[PDB]
Amino acid sequence: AQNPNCNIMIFHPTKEEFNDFDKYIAYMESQGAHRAGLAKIIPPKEWKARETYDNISEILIATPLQQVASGRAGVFTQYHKKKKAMTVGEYRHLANSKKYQTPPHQNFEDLERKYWKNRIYNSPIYGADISGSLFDENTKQWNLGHLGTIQDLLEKECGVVIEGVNTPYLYFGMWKTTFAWHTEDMDLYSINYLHLGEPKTWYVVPPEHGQRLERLARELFPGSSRGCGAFLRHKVALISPTVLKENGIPFNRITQEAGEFMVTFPYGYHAGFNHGFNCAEAINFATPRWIDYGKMASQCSCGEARVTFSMDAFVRILQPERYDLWKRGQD
Numbered sequence: 303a304q305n306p307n308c309n310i311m312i313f314h315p316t317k318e319e320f321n322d323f324d325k326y327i328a329y330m331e332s333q334g335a336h337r338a339g340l341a342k343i344i345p346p347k348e349w350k351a352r353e354t355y356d357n358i359s360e361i362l363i364a365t366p367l368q369q370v371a372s373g374r375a376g377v378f379t380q381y382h383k384k385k386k387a388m389t390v391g392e393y394r395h396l397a398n399s400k401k402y403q404t405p406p407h408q409n410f411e412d413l414e415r416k417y418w419k420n421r422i423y424n425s426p427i428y429g430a431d432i433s434g435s436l437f438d439e440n441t442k443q444w445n446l447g448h449l450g451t452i453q454d455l456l457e458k459e460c461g462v463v464i465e466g467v468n469t470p471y472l473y474f475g476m477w478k479t480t481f482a483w484h485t486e487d488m489d490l491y492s493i494n495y496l497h498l499g500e501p502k503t504w505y506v507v508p509p510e511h512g513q514r515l516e517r518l519a520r521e522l523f524p525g526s527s528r529g530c531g532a533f534l535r536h537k538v539a540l541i542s543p544t545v546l547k548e549n550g551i552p553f554n555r556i557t558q559e560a561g562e563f564m565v566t567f568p569y570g571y572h573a574g575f576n577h578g579f580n581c582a583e584a585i586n587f588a589t590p591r592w593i594d595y596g597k598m599a600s601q602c603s604c605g606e607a608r609v610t611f612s613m614d615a616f617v618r619i620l621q622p623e624r625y626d627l628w629k630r631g632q633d
């Protein structure tokens with residue numbers, strides 16, 4: 303069995319290997335990359351996402367979100383407070399302000415220490431889930447707006463034709479912006495490209511050990527667990543690496559820098575934080591190997607998780623027994 307310790311693997315495809323996206327994902331899996339839940343892909347030196355980032359300031363962040371924490375430094379939740387609209391140029395100036403800018407630090411490890419010590423005492427502002435793309439249309443390789451759609455994958459594998467679309471989303475971050483512990487909708491894959499700016503640190507639990515993280519989360523968040531049998535779908539709970547180590551939960555960590563892709567694999571729980579002002583693009587995708595994970599994915603039916611239109615069909619076709627309850631949670 304490849305990668306039996308479930309380490310995060312880093313790939314360096316050549317320009318030739320970068321042509322066929324599906325083939326390269328299958329290659330990484332042949333080497334055991336999915337066992338980690340996360341992989342890093344460094345694009346060939348000849349590749350670029352677009353020519354420059356000099357003209358992005360006028361993109362609108364319609365509903366910036368202030369991420370307010372509650373709890374203790376290593377075990378906390380966050381809620382998202384809506385703020386007034388602002389442009390990317392306005393948001394960048396805000397991220398760089400004395401109130402929000404990255405503090406002086408020695409290296410990524412020192413910054414990680416400062417994040418877990420101090421995150422809860424501040425409320426950073428995030429642009430999230432902004433439909434759009436920063437890939438140039440002429441970028442043919444690994445262009446996250448030109449991938450094969452999940453609806454087409456389901457049709458190819460299972461024969462069923464369904465409604466729905468699959469487009470990418472932009473994220474604008476600043477120091478201490480935080481992504482809570484979660485798997486993707488329907489335990490899909492994700493791909494994330496860091497277009498510009500400061501890094502993102504990721505934490506990940508191997509898919510084969512995801513239920514260990516779920517059991518710890520039920521212990522640490524006991525009222526939320528009573529409220530919903532899939533409350534991590536709410537995407538609000540944080541647990542630090544020190545707490546995970548104290549509780550014996552298997553995990554790994556890695557820092558993504560600008561110009562790098564990260565792939566999350568089905569049922570790989572992940573969480574993390576941004577180091578400073580940045581912009582990322584991400585989208586969900588599927589392969590044949592996902593189908594079995596989609597069929598088994600937990601679902602939130604309490605009303606909190608509310609998701610895209612296109613998840614309806616996935617539930618309806620892959621999880622018909624659950625469909626009526628889940629749809630009630632959507633309405």
Ligand SMILES: O=C(O)CNC(=O)C(=O)O
Binds near residue numbers: 492572583584585
């Ligand atoms: O950029 C982001 O905020 C978050 N990305 C992910 O959790 C992902 O690609 O799965």
Ligand SMILES: [Mg+2]
Binds near residue numbers: 357359360
């Ligand atoms: Mg612009």
Ligand code: NI
Binds near residue numbers: 492
């Ligand atoms: Ni994710």
Ligand SMILES: [Zn+2]
Binds near residue numbers: 531533603607
């Ligand atoms: Zn719920």
